[PDB]
Amino acid sequence: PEYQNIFTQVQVQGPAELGVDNENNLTEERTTGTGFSQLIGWIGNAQLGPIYLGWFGIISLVTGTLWFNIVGFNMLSQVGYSIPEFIRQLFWLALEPPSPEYGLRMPPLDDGGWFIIASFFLLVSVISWWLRTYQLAEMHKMGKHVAWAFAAAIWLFLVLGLFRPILMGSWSEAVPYGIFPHLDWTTAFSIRYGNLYYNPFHALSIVFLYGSVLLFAMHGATILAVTRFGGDRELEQIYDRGTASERAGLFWRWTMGFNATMEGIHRWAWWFAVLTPITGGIGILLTGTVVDNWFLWAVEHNFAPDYTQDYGYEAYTTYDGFLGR
Amino acid sequence: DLSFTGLTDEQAQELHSVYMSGLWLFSAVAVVAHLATFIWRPWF
Amino acid sequence: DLSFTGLTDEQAQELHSVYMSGLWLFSAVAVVAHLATFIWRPWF
Amino acid sequence: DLSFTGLTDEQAQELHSVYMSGLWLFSAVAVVAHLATFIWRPWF
Amino acid sequence: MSKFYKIWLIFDPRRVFVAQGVFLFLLAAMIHLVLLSTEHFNWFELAAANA
Amino acid sequence: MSKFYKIWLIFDPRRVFVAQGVFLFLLAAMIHLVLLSTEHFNWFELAAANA
Amino acid sequence: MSKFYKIWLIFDPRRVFVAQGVFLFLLAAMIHLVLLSTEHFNWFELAAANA
Amino acid sequence: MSKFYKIWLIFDPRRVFVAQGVFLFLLAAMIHLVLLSTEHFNWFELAAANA
Amino acid sequence: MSKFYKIWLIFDPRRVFVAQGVFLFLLAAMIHLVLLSTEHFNWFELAAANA
Amino acid sequence: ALLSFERKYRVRGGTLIGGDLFDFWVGPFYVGFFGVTTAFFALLGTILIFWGASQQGTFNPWLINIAPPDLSYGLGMAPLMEGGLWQIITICAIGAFVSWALREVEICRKLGMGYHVPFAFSVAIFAYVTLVVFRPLLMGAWGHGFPYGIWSHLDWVSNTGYAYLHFHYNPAHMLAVTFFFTTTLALALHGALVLSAANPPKGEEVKGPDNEDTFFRDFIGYSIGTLGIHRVGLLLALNAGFWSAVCIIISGPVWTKGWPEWWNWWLEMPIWP
Amino acid sequence: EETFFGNFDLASLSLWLFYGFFALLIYYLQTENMREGYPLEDEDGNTAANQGPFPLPKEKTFKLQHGRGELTLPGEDVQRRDNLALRKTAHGNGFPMEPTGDPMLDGVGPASWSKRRDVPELDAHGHPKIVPMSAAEGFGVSAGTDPRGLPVMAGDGEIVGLVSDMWIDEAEQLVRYLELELDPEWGDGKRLVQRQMVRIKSDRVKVRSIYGKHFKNVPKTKSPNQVTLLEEDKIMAYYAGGTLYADESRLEPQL
Amino acid sequence: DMTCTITCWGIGVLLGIMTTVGLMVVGWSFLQGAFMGVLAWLIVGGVLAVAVCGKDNAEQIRAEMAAARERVRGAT
Amino acid sequence: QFTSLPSDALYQYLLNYEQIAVHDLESRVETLPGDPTWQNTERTYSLMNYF
Ligand code: BCL
Ligand SMILES: CC[C@H]1c2cc3[nH]c4c(c3C)C(=O)[C@H](C(=O)OC)c4c3nc(cc4[nH]c(cc(n2)[C@@H]1C)c(C(C)=O)c4C)[C@@H](C)[C@@H]3CCC(=O)OC/C=C(/C)CCC[C@H](C)CCC[C@H](C)CCCC(C)C
Ligand SMILES: CC[C@H]1c2cc3[nH]c4c(c3C)C(=O)[C@H](C(=O)OC)c4c3nc(cc4[nH]c(cc(n2)[C@@H]1C)c(C(C)=O)c4C)[C@@H](C)[C@@H]3CCC(=O)OC/C=C(\C)CCC[C@H](C)CCC[C@H](C)CCCC(C)C
Ligand SMILES: CC[C@H]1c2cc3[nH]c4c(c3C)C(=O)[C@H](C(=O)OC)c4c3nc(cc4[nH]c(cc(n2)[C@@H]1C)c(C(C)=O)c4C)[C@@H](C)[C@@H]3CCC(=O)OC/C=C(\C)CCC[C@H](C)CCC[C@H](C)CCCC(C)C
Ligand SMILES: CCCCCCCC/C=C\CCCCCCCC(=O)O[C@H](COC(=O)CCCCCCCCCCCCCCCCC)COP(=O)(O)OC[C@@H](O)CO
Ligand SMILES: CCCCCCCC/C=C\CCCCCCCC(=O)O[C@H](COC(=O)CCCCCCCCCCCCCCCCC)COP(=O)(O)OC[C@@H](O)CO
Ligand SMILES: CCCCCCCC/C=C\CCCCCCCC(=O)O[C@H](COC(=O)CCCCCCCCCCCCCCCCC)COP(=O)(O)OC[C@@H](O)CO
Ligand SMILES: COC(C)(C)C(=O)C/C=C(\C)CC/C=C(\C)CC/C=C(\C)CCCC/C(C)=C/CCC(C)CC/C=C(\C)CCC=C(C)C
Ligand SMILES: COC(C)(C)C(=O)C/C=C(\C)CC/C=C(\C)CC/C=C(\C)CCCC/C(C)=C/CCC(C)CC/C=C(\C)CCC=C(C)C
Ligand SMILES: COC(C)(C)C(=O)C/C=C(\C)CC/C=C(\C)CC/C=C(\C)CCCC/C(C)=C/CCC(C)CC/C=C(\C)CCC=C(C)C
Ligand SMILES: COC(C)(C)C(=O)C/C=C(\C)CC/C=C(\C)CC/C=C(\C)CCCC/C(C)=C/CCC(C)CC/C=C(\C)CCC=C(C)C
Ligand SMILES: COC(C)(C)C(=O)C/C=C(\C)CC/C=C(\C)CC/C=C(\C)CCCC/C(C)=C\CCC(C)CC/C=C(\C)CCC=C(C)C
Ligand SMILES: [Fe+3]
Incomplete structure (x- = not known):
């Protein structure tokens, strides 16, 4: 071949x-x-x-390493300073958020005080890495698209950890620092508030995530098929159109009836990716504060399906018949 | 004389005559079908 | 004279008269239908 | 003369003649099949 | 009106005819399917009932 | 007014005509469907009730 | 009504014939399946019942 | 007030006309839909109760 | 009816024969399978039951 | 209507089957042999979906639901109202997808390009055939497929995951989620970098690849390059779809218990005290 | 929490606001991608009656580097070909075109090139970007098999010459072209092959797209030390056209 | 010498398969034996592609290269 | 049950009498201090894994 x-x-x-x-x-x-x-x-x-190495990057690195070590040392001390057990249960340990009884006040160090001190160091670290991404474009005399795309994800980060707990009135609404424990938080959050499938902004976020992955398969494949005409040199193709851009456009025009340009496909990619955390954060911010049961909301607004058949295994079979007896 | 399609006035008249002639037969067939349907199951 | 599309005054006038004729015919058909429907099943 | 396909007047009449002759052989067969089906299992 | 024939000085017949054919077939299918979703006008079920 | 025809010195007739053609059919379909969702104006159920 | 042959001055037969060939066979297959999905007009079940 | 005509020296009429048309239709539809959500001003339901 | 040979002035026989063969074989296979999907017309089950 | 540069590319040839019998265009669309088979299959499938919707009793797009048969029917054919329409629509959808891929192949052949796009689409076809043909055949009944409904195919996903208690603990689902998130972060970065290179502040000149390579080594100390980023994006996307198919085909036919219990092999390894 | 009217609450208001914003965003995105190739034309070169539902965008200007000037889009098509040896196979629209002479020599079909600028692409320092390796200070083969000195085999199984040099992009540190010296039996001079069209093996280098008899008609560069964008497009399109035009069996249905 | 690297990675794959079967004879389960097999592959096959494939051929060439590196230093 | 969910269940539920239900029975409610949270939902999830 x-x-x-x-x-x-x-x-x-x-x-x-x-x-x-x-x-x-x-x-x-x-x-x-x-x-x-x-x-x-x-x-x-x-x-x-x-x-x-600027100051923003150095501050971000130092404060992020501090967060990591407060979590890691708390995890190590929870197990009795036993290194082999520390390794055995690494995926299961976590640094837990405070108890609901303390509200938005400062909790005891054993019950969420270290969690709040470490959360303040992670916050500082993330905002510093963003100021570095903005400064480097300014210093390089380029556009600020990278910083805006990063702030799009920082929006959902802050909604999950800072805004929603404050609007709800408890630090206990935050996410724990763990591998498995954080996945248990996701499942419990979905269960507690009905079914998160029936949150329309969750559906929109899924739409945009699916769309962003379909577009890198299409864009990566299309660019690799026109590399025999110099198609990976995109900027010069923008400044002076060549045959690679023409063939790439005509493929999709003949396939699905419309196409893009060399410069304009990147705007499509930028927007689909950026739109996922924005819609996700808007959906998360509305939970508990406005809507408490999303399935009842769907029943109210008439997009919940109905089923006619019955429930139960003995409506379809017999216990003896399922065993072969 | 405005024209975006490149047709002339006479060509447009000739086309419209046949278009209307073919549009009336479709309406007549639909009217007959609707009358037969009303006689079998009225709706008003 | 100002013109963003390329037509002249006479072409615009001629187009507008033919547009208004169809608008009035459509409105008359709608009026007849509305009156018949009101007679059959009144609202208000 | 308006012609988007490039055919002349006589070529179009020839093609139409043969097309309409296959429309009648298809319609007659369909009519006989529908008559047999109605006799077998009526629906009106 | 007498000047309606000028509509073909604006729209190309080749595209208009295709669009109209698609629209007419879709409308006919929609109506024929809407009649079959009711009880009084479903002729397949009526033929079974008068069996 | 007597100078409304100048609207065609601003807007292109083709794009306006296509947009209006789509808009009118969508509006008519929406109204015909809104009537069918009520009890007092659904003619299909009225025909069955009076049959 | 006598000037219908002029339709062949607008459309090339090569495209129209393949469009019609797809359309006709699609319709036939659908009506046979709509008929096969009823109780009164399924001829495979009738031969089993009448036996 | 005599010098409001200079608004067309700032804004392009082609954009403003399209935006105004869309805005006006959407606002009218929203008001008409808000009236139908009440009981005292729903004319479809008022008609049923007066028959 | 006597001028149906002119179909070979529009369509090339080389590319028509292959498509016709594929269509015919697929249709025959579908019909045989549909018959095999029933109870009354499954001839493999009938021989076992009869004997 | 053609683009300003399109006429010289519209030549004859490059078809897998059909010759010049279907070698033409309708509007912007190209038709060939696989354009006629796609149209037939897709139109039949849609018409059958709407006939089923009419027989169900609702035309609401949110509430239309066409479902597979009961498990008691096994791998046989069900009555058309109790799940057979789903089987017919599944066959039609498989045919339409394969015809779409083979049409893309012919377009690639005519334009003289590589065949990367149909190969990438084959991965998405494989994830769908695993959900409606491979897992159901292995599990022994067509009733294991998901239903065709906008809001009813989410109920299937929810019930299928809680049938293994805690689906997050599936090892191959964790790999697949990581691939999805990484593709989106890389697409965002690539689009941002190209746009920032082509759109500088007002009054400045445009930038080149050297500037892009430099910004990224300054930001994180490494730059994949203008050719590497497309290879990496394609590989990430294809790995995401392959691992998704694996996560579903092991959940049923290979594992029966809860997914957390699968981790027991790590918790009771003999090295641990 | 309460509702404003009926069932309308804050979530519904947010959803409808997003609907409106997304409609405006779709309009902006579709309009931004219409800066090349418009207005539409028919198969005879005249402006088409239909131009679609979206109007064209306003103008943007790009300030280029190294004193190349300014670029304003949308504008006139400056990359348009002048005299194409093509023939209509029908009287209307929607049917293919036939070459009048040799498709590979006339640059039509899959062999088509676009009229780019007749200057080489520059790097950050204002120097040509692609340079032969024999003049590139400090570069060497660090991995893989070196193709220099190996014979080249065509698609029909003929040896046409030897690899003499490689042309590399120094800014990105990548090989772009291979330079081939032809035997007298198969032509004269030197030719170039883009890297994406060769397979380098241990004893040979394979080019499958074209045959041996096609190797004398590959376009030639003017200077032995640099290549312009137009020459690059004509060389790459020539090799790309062989995938369809090299043999008559490659053009007919494979069945 | 990318061909010696691939050979060395394949000997690692083969040692991993053998580690699984050996732990299973001694009493371990498949997945427990296969985690250990994967690490044998990655640690050992990696180590051999650095050490064995880095003893590249050169003979008096090796000598002079090294004796000249020993001249760079001395004035560095 | 091989998870990191609370090991406090079976003692607050099957030995003492604590509430297992966590769901709100309305689409929109006013959340008060003392209402169930996701922490209680995780304990119920542990009990259900035990079941
Ligand atoms: C039982 C499980 C629930 C469920 C519960 C939830 C919950 C709860 C949430 C999601 C959310 C999401 N769900 Mg869901 N979800 C379910 C089922 C699904 C299914 C499916 C069945 O196929 C899919 C495809 C998804 C997919 C999604 C995504 C579309 C979305 C996350 C958006 C995003 O940007 O993520 C990418 C993630 C981020 C952008 C996080 C931000 C990361 C930050 C910026 C990192 C900072 C740097 C870091 C600290 C430094 C690290 C160290 C470095 C090495 C230096 N869900 C079911 C119904 N889902 C989220 C959402 O938005 O809801 C609307 C959310 O919160
Ligand atoms: C999402 C993208 C992720 C990413 C990727 C990334 N970063 C990278 C790389 C990659 C792929 C490197 O290869 C490069 C590196 O050399 O890492 C050791 C690096 C790097 N990213 C760094 C920083 C960095 N990246 C960050 C982020 C990220 N970069 C993300 C996690 C961040 C934060 C907090 O956001 C920081 C602070 C440094 C650790 C490093 C900067 C490179 C550097 O300083 O190189 C100096 C050169 C050397 C001599 C060291 C090379 C080691 C060997 C002795 C050289 C011989 C090579 C050998 C044959 C192979 C070994 C290399 C391996 C990396 C394969
Ligand atoms: C538009 C939404 C998508 C997105 C985009 C996005 N993410 C981004 C960006 C953008 C546009 C950046 O510009 C920024 C970046 O730097 O990218 C390279 C980033 C980023 N997104 C990241 C993570 C991330 N993004 C995610 C999601 C997403 N981001 C979405 C898919 C996710 C998830 C959960 O899916 C994660 C996990 C980071 C890689 C980076 C943000 C860097 C940052 O803020 O770092 C703070 C640093 C510290 C914690 C201090 C360092 C301490 C470390 C614990 C150890 C030392 C560092 C070392 C290099 C790592 C260890 C390796 C060893 C071998 C040395
Ligand atoms: C790495 C795999 C990713 C991928 C790749 C991929 N898909 C692709 C491509 C590629 C590379 C194309 O080139 C191709 C294309 O042309 O895109 C524009 C395509 C494509 N993938 C698409 C969509 C799509 N891709 C998805 C995902 C993905 N595709 C992955 C993320 C998803 C989801 C759910 O995430 C969807 C919805 C199409 C837009 C497109 C081309 C498919 C197509 O047009 O097929 C022809 C068929 C029809 C026009 C109609 C068929 C009608 C049927 C007969 C009836 C319908 C039955 C159906 C099963 C009902 C389902 C109901 C639901 C509510 C459940
Ligand atoms: C309701 C209507 C659709 C029918 C319902 C079933 C399908 C629903 C699914 C998808 C719809 C996609 C349909 C697209 C088909 C386009 C056909 C085509 O080709 O149309 C072109 C015109 O289109 C375009 O120019 C592109 C249109 C956008 C593409 C889809 C975007 C998907 C974005 C986001 C994902 C969507 C999820 C929802 C998010 C909900 C958010 C709340 C004619 O040609 P043109 O030359 O390009 O004209 C233009 C110019 O040039 C003028 O000159
Ligand atoms: C073959 C069997 C079909 C398979 C059956 C399965 C059914 C479903 C499959 C496909 C449906 C798509 C069908 C539409 C394709 C039309 C063909 C076409 O496009 O034909 C063009 C003619 O244009 C048009 O007809 C314009 C179409 C307008 C598109 C709407 C734009 C937004 C739309 C969507 C936004 C989405 C957002 C969310 C949505 C919710 C909100 C919508 C010829 O073009 P031309 O002659 O080259 O030039 C002219 C050019 O410029 C423009 O006029
Ligand atoms: C809620 C979503 C509903 C479903 C989705 C439809 C709405 C989405 C939006 C648009 C759909 C495409 C319709 C618009 C484009 C069609 C192409 C077109 O307009 O073609 C014109 C011919 O037409 C007209 O002159 C306008 C009349 C259109 C009427 C049909 C309305 C379709 C309405 C609906 C679909 C079918 C109904 C029949 C079945 C029942 C429901 C099951 C040729 O002239 P031209 O050469 O293009 O003009 C040059 C110009 O472009 C210069 O710029
Ligand atoms: C009940 O509520 C719901 C929503 C369910 C509904 O059902 C609502 C329904 C509607 C709102 C429906 C609305 C329907 C319409 C507005 C329908 C309109 C239909 C037409 C205008 C149809 C017109 C058809 C015209 C035809 C077929 C005319 C002519 C065709 C030909 C003449 C072909 C021959 C042409 C030739 C020869 C031209 C060549 C001439 C030359 C000179 C070359
Ligand atoms: C009750 O609450 C709810 C929300 C449910 C509602 O239902 C609310 C609804 C609304 C608020 C609805 C509002 C509706 C409107 C504002 C509708 C307006 C409609 C129009 C203005 C329609 C106009 C139509 C005009 C037409 C069809 C005129 C002419 C057409 C032609 C003449 C065609 C022929 C044209 C030719 C030949 C051009 C001549 C060419 C030349 C070259 C001379
Ligand atoms: C129950 O309701 C539902 C929805 C289920 C429905 O089923 C609804 C269904 C419909 C709404 C159906 C609608 C159906 C139609 C509109 C059908 C129309 C059918 C036709 C117009 C059929 C035409 C057939 C024509 C034929 C067969 C013509 C010709 C055939 C030839 C072989 C002619 C040969 C020609 C030659 C050789 C030309 C050569 C001449 C030269 C000069 C070279
Ligand atoms: C109850 O609470 C809720 C939220 C529900 C509400 O409903 C709140 C609602 C509001 C807050 C509503 C607010 C509404 C407004 C601010 C409305 C404003 C409306 C207007 C300003 C309307 C203007 C309309 C103008 C019109 C129709 C002009 C038409 C002009 C022409 C047809 C002439 C066209 C021009 C031409 C031809 C130019 C000549 C051309 C030349 C070349 C010379
Ligand atoms: C002991 O061994 C050594 C030394 C090697 C170690 O250090 C080992 C370390 C480890 C083994 C560490 C392991 C760490 C993990 C497994 C970490 C996992 C972390 C997460 C999954 C974190 C998720 C975090 C956050 C989420 C999901 C969302 C939002 C969060 C925030 C916005 C946080 C910001 C908080 C704010 C703003 C509140 C601050 C409070 C104020 C009052 C200002
Ligand atoms: Fe790109």
């Missing part, structure tokens, strides 16, 4: 790239030192490093 372009046939290596610069002097804060990995180079670039 013809070459498919998933793995590079032959690799070439030269002097390491140190990056572009302008009057903002980005070189002063960049680390010196690079590496090369030939295992990764079969798929993408092989160069590793360098990285930029």
